[PDB]
Structures are given as structure tokens and as C-alpha cells.
């Protein structure tokens, strides 16, 4: 429900390196 790059259908995902 809340975090970064790392799920399939809400919204957070990935994002940088």
C-alpha cells in the first residue's frame, strides 16, 4: 500500500538507480 517500485496494479513501482 505504500512503498517503491514493487507492485502490479496501484501505483508505486520502481523508479531510480
Known sequence: ?????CTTXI???XCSS
Open 1 to 5: 500500500i505504500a512503498s517503491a517500485s
Open 11 to 13: 501505483c508505486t513501482c
